[PDB]
């Protein structure tokens, strides 16, 4: 408060003291939007008890989970798809506009313990199925887990057991258009950039409003001190405190209002992860578009990304029916 | 520890990390790098010359854009009067002067007492007067040997007849006959009609009070507008790694000045960025590029383990490198990515988080002391996947949990 | 003899430094794409142009010529002995500056007889009761022997006379910015101006414009150079 | 301690400072009441699906497999009790598709 | 802002400029909440091809 309003003078602190307690009220509100932002990410990710790993030999019956699993060459032990999303969203005078007493705090979970949380959920849903989220992990081969899931939408098992190669080829070809869709279009991540633009733009008006006299001789608090009578200044210095205090309340109110939809959006990811990943869903158009089979998560800057696998029919015909 | 009790205003504090105060460093060396590039004011052409003016027709000269240095008058000039109004004589070297004017006239030896506000006389009523709100100095000295001759000198004149009293800084150079009676003069000198302007007579053998004198009047304003007549301090050539007060030609504040790589254009003097912040300045005497950097911001917070169990605390200096801050305004310094912990040691094992700090570090209480460790996500497990194996349960268990949700709050009304 | 300046005329208003900033300013500028007046001084009939022009706010002066025939301009209110004047005359040896109550005739001008050497100086008759002068250092300039261009801006605010100029070799389709050159305080009343020229032993170009209060957008450079500026009132 | 045309200027800062400190209180009470109405609609849904029936949504009513539920009351709130079913004591075997 | 506050007088259009950007900021919320309403009525109904 004081470093922004009264600068470094002592003729201003005494006048500011008369306005009651309008600093512990504006400082206890910005510290409530700093613990919630760290509690938000402890519900989306921290849902697993232990840390699972994948065995070295990779015999999954034909499917190729090579472009979403970690590799050791690149750092942070990220995968090949989490390393194309970072280059897209850009985090852009931050170097020295800290004159007036502004600070940025670091988040609690560094971006190396989230890559270790999204690499356990993925490796435990391949070798176990859906039993690792409701007890103890139990192993099962992949080609039978797929039949288990395939029995849940109506079709029987021999349909899968007679067309394993075709389904494997279709899945492998399907995953791989996403790479070309993401590595060529630099506008796919659209709604993850507004949360940066609208936050970094509202911080400029606060600084740019520091040089507007609200009805005084000048907007610098030294030319009304060097050349004005000591009694006369306290009449026009009092004209700047109200001006610089009325612009420090709209900012706080706007931030308080805006940080209430982020909670609503983060309360939906914690449900989507618990229902579309740790199980199978029957609600229409919730986890994709079609018939739901399975899903995979990925991490992104200040957000999460999902991949949905579905089932779609084709090649109809005509017949003739009768009730009985 | 006592600060927290006086911040939340109680006698008992629970577990947690609390923000209490701030951390500022006061500049020490106040400097005025006064830009006295220009040459000295005409201290010779003003004080001494060949000839002077009279009382009824004085002179006015404007002096501006020069440096004030009166020390050159000590070797030659020998004054006889020195009085100042509105400013201290000793403080004139450290101030500035604006709209400075000098007036020159020659008055009599015994008539030098009339050069002061609130006086009466024949020079103060018809020739020259001073305002009541006077701010300046008046200097007078003798010129007997340079303004005397055998037979008398009759080039100096003064006014003797006038209709009423003059006003401060009002000049009357009109000459006319003065009618001293009810009979009109009709422009011809005669009875009750004299010339209002008379002449002075000075001789080398005249008395002490009958010798010529030279007086100079100086007037200026103090601290209300930009000024061009100024005095130097010359406490320049500072140290380049300390936070000091700086007073350039048209800037004032505090910071650290170093040497930069940018190039200022000749028609440019200051430096600015996208935001309206001062970040550069050019030396007017050395023509070099300088920078400005903050030194005096930051905040500190106190970590406590429970106020009755112990009286040990640790403090964190946010965003401060562990060289500027003293260990106690230590033998225990840990450098993290969030600040500089002081009072806690570094352990190697990993536990669960107890009191968050930031960047993946925590702190906990465990005789006993305070430790800082790296939080651990969880245990480790592996699944023995194979293409012809399966696992099936053989028993079961029944469990009961709870869950709490708020539904409503208190109603209230105001008048 | 009418032509409109497309995007010519821009002077540095500030005194500070910036690097890659599109800060916008509001001051007095000549409107973009505004017609100005063209004057001609040629000898085939011989042409001699030197009328009296108004001085409402300021005049964007440009002069195109192969040889220096324009020396300076006369200034004042009524141009007599009853009022002061600002005299800026180049006498082919030094720049002459004086603030006096001169007495001008109908056609004050310079001239030569031949090789080439000044032969006349007929500007003023009487000038008294004035307290300003300024003499530039002597120099030698060749005479005789379009390629060059010189641009000037005149402004008189708060008893101060400011001039901006830039020399760079009809009028072309270039674009350049103007920097301050001189600064002299006078504190007088100015309402008219008139130029003077020279002739080569014979009896009997430049454009004059205006400004308006209009705000522009200035785009700087890394080195603090105004490369491009765009108006904000021309087209939607 | 003052006269009628002189005290009016004195009492124009109290009734302009006590008035700005009221609108702040009301504004902050219009946002707190909007975060509880988002929690009084979650409890209503959790009472029509976990209690009056059986739910197949994962991790909605407890952890494990849902069997039934019981409500209890509390000051300005509600408390639930969830009953679930959990396996144990696994073993190894060998499988074949057909 | 400019028409609601002080009509069309030119004695206020000059005194209002020394208050910063208080009325450019208030002319952006009542355009960011005027497009969300046009987007809302597209999620509910436009669910078919
Ligand atoms: C004092 O601290 C101890 C921790 O050892 C705690 O058990 C106790 O409850 C505290 N005192 C009170 C009055 O709570
Ligand atoms: C902790 O680690 C440091 C460096 O790895 C080592 O010097 C120190 O001896 C270790 N302490 C213990 C108790 O293992
Ligand atoms: C061209 O000059 C004429 C002067 O006769 C003027 O009326 C006209 O507006 C000018 N053209 C433009 C585009 O301004």
Residue numbers in the entry:
A (entry chain B): 738 to 829, 849 to 1080
B (entry chain A): 296 to 624, 639 to 675, 689 to 737
C (entry chain B): 27 to 70, 76 to 145, 151 to 181, 186 to 209, 215 to 249, 264 to 295
D (entry chain A): 983 to 1080
E (entry chain C): 738 to 786
Quote the study on this structure:
Like other β-coronaviruses, SARS-CoV-2 utilizes the trimeric spike glycoprotein on its envelope to mediate viral entry into host cells. Each protomer of spike protein in the extracellular domain is composed of S1 and S2 subunits, which are responsible for binding to host cell targets and the membrane fusion process, respectively. It has been revealed that the prefusion spike protein mainly includes two conformational states: the closed state with all three “down” receptor-binding domains (RBDs) in the S1 subunit, and the open state with one or more “up” RBDs. In one cryo-EM study, Toelzer et al. involuntarily found that essential FFA linoleic acid (LA) bound in three composite pockets of the RBD domains of SARS-CoV-2 spike protein.
To explore the binding mode of SPC-14 against spike protein, we parallelly prepared cryo-EM grids by incubating the same batch of purified SARS-CoV-2 spike protein with SPC-14 (at a 1:10 molar ratio) or without SPC-14 as a vehicle control on ice for 40 min. For the spike+SPC-14 system, about 48% of the particles were in the closed state (three RBD “down”), and the other 52% of the particles were in the open state with one RBD “up”. On the contrary, for the apo spike system, almost all the particles were in the open state with one RBD “up”, which is consistent with several previously described cryo-EM structures. The cryo-EM structures of the closed state spike+SPC-14 and the apo spike were solved to resolutions of 3.06 and 3.27 Å, respectively. Intriguingly, additional densities located on the three FFA-binding pockets are evident in the closed state spike+SPC-14 map, but not the open state spike+SPC-14 map and the apo spike map.
